[PDB]
Amino acid sequence: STNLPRNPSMADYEARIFTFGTWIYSVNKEQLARAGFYALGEGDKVKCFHCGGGLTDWKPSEDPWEQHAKWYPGCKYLLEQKGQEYINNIHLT
Ligand SMILES: [Zn+2]
């Protein structure tokens, strides 16, 4: 299902934040890991443990939850943590 994570090995926040040990980019690693992302080890590429959606080319001080909702609104981890109202608002500008 979409209710199960694509990468269960990254389902723990502690595991995700660990992948950002070598993170030099201007996007907050705690916010990234909170939003479900872990680092792939190539540039600023990250992937969501649940939906598998990848993001790259981050702008400085960008909001990871906003980008998660912008590009991958069907993610069930995004839904659980942020709710449908938030996802809809992101797409209403
Ligand atoms: Zn996701």
Residue numbers in the entry: 253 to 345
Sentences copied from the publication:
We recently reported on compound 142D6 as a potent aryl-fluorosulfate-based Lys-covalent pan-IAP agent. The agent was designed to juxtapose more directly an aryl-fluorosulfate with a Lys residue within the binding pocket of the BIR3 domain of XIAP.
Prior to and after refinement, this density was an exact fit for 142D6. Engagement with the P2 site is observed to be primarily driven by a β sheet like hydrogen bonding network that pairs up the carbonyl and amine of 142D6’s l-cyclohexyl glycine with the corresponding main-chain amine of Leu307 and carbonyl Thr308. Interactions between 142D6 and residues surrounding P4 occur via a hydrogen bond with Gly306 and the amine from 1-aminoindane of 142D6 with the sidechain of this moiety inserting itself into a pocket formed by the sidechains of Lys297 and Leu292 along with a portion of the main chain in XIAP-BIR3.
